[PDB]
Amino acid sequence: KIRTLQGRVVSDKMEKSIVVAIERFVKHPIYGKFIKRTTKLHVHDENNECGIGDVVEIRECRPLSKTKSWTLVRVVEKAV
Amino acid sequence: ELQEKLIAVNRVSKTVKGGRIFSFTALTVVGDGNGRVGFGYGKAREVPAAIQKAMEKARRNMINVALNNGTLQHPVKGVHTGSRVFMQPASEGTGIIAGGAMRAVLEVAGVHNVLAKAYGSTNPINVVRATIDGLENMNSPEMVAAKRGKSVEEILG
Amino acid sequence: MVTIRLARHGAKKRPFYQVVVADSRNARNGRFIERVGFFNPIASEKEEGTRLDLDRIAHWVGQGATISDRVAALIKEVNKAA
Amino acid sequence: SMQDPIADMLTRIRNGQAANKAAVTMPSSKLKVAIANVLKEEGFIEDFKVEGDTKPELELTLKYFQGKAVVESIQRVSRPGLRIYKRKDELPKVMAGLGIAVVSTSKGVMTDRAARQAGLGGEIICYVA
Amino acid sequence: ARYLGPKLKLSRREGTDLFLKSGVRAIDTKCKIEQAPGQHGARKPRLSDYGVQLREKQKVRRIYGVLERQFRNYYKEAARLKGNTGENLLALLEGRLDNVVYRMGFGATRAEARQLVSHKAIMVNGRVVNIASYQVSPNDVVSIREKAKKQSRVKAALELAEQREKPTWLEVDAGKMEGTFKRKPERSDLSADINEHLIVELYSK
Amino acid sequence: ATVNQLVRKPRARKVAKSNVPALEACPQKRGVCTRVYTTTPKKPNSALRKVCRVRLTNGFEVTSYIGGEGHNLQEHSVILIRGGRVKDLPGVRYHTVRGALDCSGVKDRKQARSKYGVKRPKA
RNA sequence: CCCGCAGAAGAAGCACCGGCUAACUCCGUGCCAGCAGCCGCGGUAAUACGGAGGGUGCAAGCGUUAAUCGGAAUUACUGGGCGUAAAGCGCACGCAGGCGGUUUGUUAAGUCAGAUGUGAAAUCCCCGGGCUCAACCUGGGAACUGCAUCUGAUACUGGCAA
RNA sequence: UAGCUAGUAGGUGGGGUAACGGCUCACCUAGGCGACGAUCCCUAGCUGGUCUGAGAGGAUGACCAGCCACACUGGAACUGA
């Protein structure tokens, strides 16, 4: 079974690459409040099958460029 | 028998036309040693009459305190005039671990193992009213089962 | 080369060797992969002097591992009856 | 603007026992009924009943043992601004065990004593002293 | 280390008798007891709440002859040890070797019985032990070596020791000069006078 | 308060400033002690306080109080300088260690002899 | 390490004693010399300066300086405040953000339970063992509040749908 | 300290490496990072731990042990697993 993460596309205009932000729901170490943090990754897609603002599921692969180590798995909740 | 214990003697003034005229205030706490405790303030012109006037006020202002085997029932707080006082039951804490004017009121009540800490102002008059407000608000498991659960084996567990 | 050797711990004039499985390049008290027992040479005639987990030691020599002269001596010293 | 209905329910009990009222009224909900059922089974309140179909309203008849009230103190622990979840070995005991802590666990809403014996924890809702 | 001074000035500062002398008589009434520990001895002080905690700790420390670094390590091991740390501090002070040999009667004072056990004379369980602060376990037998047996001092303290209350947590034969430490002394057997909770309160200050 | 505010800006620990800035984590400092002189104290006190300016070995030039009764400090007296202010002189934060390098001990001391650098009266 | 010989023989200081803070009198000096961590002492009868006697503390150490934390709830998550003590923006509107009434379905993210891998050893803690005891050394366990995966739980929170 | 970045960000292709990769080169795309603090400046080896504290924390990283970096200063490759 493959470790994989969800996340929404922030930008797509970079020629067979898209960037994806992952929101994790972490607790504060001191104060105990739950704070939304962000994990903007540069993920790889083949033929640009993703616009802006849609959920993309990704998994980790070999390094493909400088800060590109994730490829696409599928697309759910395609942008309207 | 009633464990008279003077805490502090102060010197207060009145400022009259001639000069300043002084008098003395005391603060003594009494108590049998099994859960009764009372403080009386008292003030007079000389020192031993100010302490003796505190003894008569302290005997007619005793309250009832519930203790389990010489220690408290539960962690309890007490607030009086900027004096926040915390006290723990301290299950064999082995000693009255309390500050000035908080230790003396706990010696005459008969309670022997407390971890106590006083926040805010540690004025000796106000911290004795803070502990006494903390001790009579403390309730025993017999009093809690009398109003909730209706069984002491079911209230505690 | 993994080696099963003695790392000298304990105080001055009171040595205590830990029978340990370490790479040969590392230091004596340095890194190791596993410890597999101890050896107390000054534990004289009282109740207990040495203990080695011989199943884990036989596992490492199956993977290929040289053993020191003392470790080979304590494995001999836990005899067939003693 | 009405962001914690649970703390508003405990505030009505706290102000009802202070004003020596016979009963208190609040708009009912599923969580308000379930924690009031915990308050009735322990002995802090008696005889809760919901009245209404489309706008339900929950009644709580408050208890007074002596002239003093029964609910000595009641706090709201897991605020909406700060939610607090505790483990099995991390459930607190109020007043060294003679108070209750209402915990919402995965098997329903119960006390701290009933959730320690179940062997599971959750969001601690309130401390009823 | 040790005091090496006048051992009745310490008993006068505390007021009570600390049994620092052998007592062939009773109160020596050669020392002016309960009247003056010094030049300003008739001037008795207010003796504040810190001072009453200090006097009780210095009273117990002067009975056994320990120092403060050694006494604070006794409190520190009594606090971590399970149970009541008030009587745990007294079980460790009565577990000392120089104290046990006093209570068996082989020494007339604590300082005399310390000089026997320090001078290689007293053995525990058939093995020669040299120090004063050896913690004896239950059912350990402490003997006297034959080179310092028949010492014009050890049996002379034994006919003095029938009046020393017969400590019944250790049995003494005193004819063969052996004795075993049966069990640890409880709080109900130690002099009914010392307030050990003042010592636990002083180190929490 | 208001715990969402503390996430955006945590509670700043107040920094405690040292009172002896001349000797950093240094227990004592050594100087060259130019211009030994005397000054008068602040108000309710009245004396001629024996004090000295001193240029330390780190480059700092501070003013240091010469404790005790009588001294031997002459303008190029290499001395040792420890902390401790006076509360009576404006600007003096340090004490000269008596009996350390050149500032010899006080004549005829019998009590508190480790302070002021006085040996035991043997004979 | 053990044994033998001789002889109480080779071996006690340092700070402090006005309040805090345990422990006080006398003489000298007279806002001088000086002390002082803070309050403050010293102006001719100083328990505060210097000396003497006495006492208290700790002990082969003892005090001083330096530094850190504690006391300090005096940056307060535990655990503080804002009418007048320091402190409500002059008053609005509003984006990101934070939070959100009520019912049902669904999801299992947060949450919780279990399991697995790991979280090196030493250290800390617990029960023991070895050094005459102790410091020290050491066996075993606990702990390493974690992270990751897997399997469930579905009350609350979140997503989604009505 | 509010904008920073042109091999910069991405693609394709050749070359290099023990190995992925702007690691390198040529050509195209115009991106990439940033108020969740980029960039710049000051300081600093990191950790297991140590000290303190009731705890939460605060301070710290000497010894022992793990990792990194350095070897007169700066630069470089050779030999070799």
Side-chain angles (χ1 to χ4, degrees), chain B residues 92-97 103 107 112, chain E residues 49 53 84-86 198 200-201 204:
Chain B
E92 266 293 328
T94 318
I96 305 160
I97 313 300
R103 183 162 186 271
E107 291 186 356
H112 295 144
Chain E
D49 190 64
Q53 289 178 338
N84 194 9
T85 186
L198 291 183
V200 193
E201 272 152 21
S204 74

Side-chain angles (χ1 to χ4, degrees), chain B residues 38-60:
Chain B
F39 85 110
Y41 184 52
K43 48 179 294 198
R45 204 75 79 82
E46 73 186 9
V47 182
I51 309 165
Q52 199 271 331
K53 207 186 296 186
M55 299 309 187
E56 294 294 327
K57 280 185 177 66
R59 287 159 219 275
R60 60 192 204 116

Side-chain angles (χ1 to χ4, degrees), chain D residues 58-119:
Chain D
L58 177 59
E59 304 281 332
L60 278 75
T61 64
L62 298 175
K63 296 181 56 184
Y64 305 89
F65 175 59
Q66 307 284 345
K68 315 172 81 43
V70 170
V71 183
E72 191 153 38
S73 177
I74 171 156
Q75 262 57 64
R76 171 83 158 120
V77 176
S78 82
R79 297 190 288 112
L82 180 73
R83 303 256 178 214
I84 291 177
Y85 313 99
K86 295 294 186 183
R87 259 84 175 272
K88 164 182 63 180
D89 205 12
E90 220 177 356
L91 291 186
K93 39 180 75 168
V94 189
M95 299 175 75
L98 55 87
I100 73 165
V102 170
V103 195
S104 69
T105 78
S106 62
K107 284 278 135 166
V109 176
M110 55 199 53
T111 63
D112 56 353
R113 187 167 35 88
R116 276 204 208 81
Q117 200 163 5

Side-chain angles (χ1 to χ4, degrees), chain C residues 13-64:
Chain C
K13 301 295 232 304
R14 320 283 312 280
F16 198 95
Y17 304 102
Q18 296 270 104
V19 180
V20 76
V21 176
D23 189 12
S24 297
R25 283 172 277 177
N26 277 294
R28 187 189 70 190
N29 292 11
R31 249 170 69 176
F32 45 87
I33 299 97
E34 266 193 5
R35 71 163 268 266
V36 286
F38 59 95
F39 170 68
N40 200 3
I42 62 172
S44 69
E45 200 161 32
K46 38 188 74 168
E47 65 268 13
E48 176 73 32
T50 180
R51 181 185 328 169
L52 281 76
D53 185 2
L54 296 176
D55 192 313
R56 282 306 281 186
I57 296 178
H59 171 253
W60 276 108
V61 306
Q63 306 308 104

Side-chain angles (χ1 to χ4, degrees), chain F residues 20-91:
Chain F
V20 280
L23 34 142
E24 325 77 328
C26 279
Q28 301 93 4
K29 231 42 163 199
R30 179 195 65 140
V32 74
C33 191
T34 83
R35 194 189 140 80
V36 181
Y37 62 101
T38 57
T39 42
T40 60
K42 297 183 71 68
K43 215 349 143 212
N45 273 354
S46 160
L48 281 177
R49 299 278 144 102
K50 282 91 190 176
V51 78
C52 60
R53 212 154 62 211
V54 54
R55 178 165 292 265
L56 294 185
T57 196
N58 61 339
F60 274 57
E61 54 96 20
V62 295
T63 309
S64 180
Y65 182 75
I66 310 153
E69 305 182 349
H71 61 94
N72 59 320
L73 276 77
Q74 297 294 110
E75 192 58 56
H76 293 30
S77 237
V78 48
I79 55 175
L80 200 62
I81 293 306
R82 72 171 161 86
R85 68 187 279 270
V86 189
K87 191 258 180 182
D88 217 359
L89 298 169

Side-chain angles (χ1 to χ4, degrees), chain A residues 6 18 22-23 30 35 49 55-56 58 62 64-65 69:
Chain A
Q6 297 258 310
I18 47 155
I22 305 186
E23 285 85 4
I30 296 98
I35 286 95
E49 283 136 353
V55 163
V56 171
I58 56 171
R62 68 176 171 90
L64 313 169
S65 289
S69 297

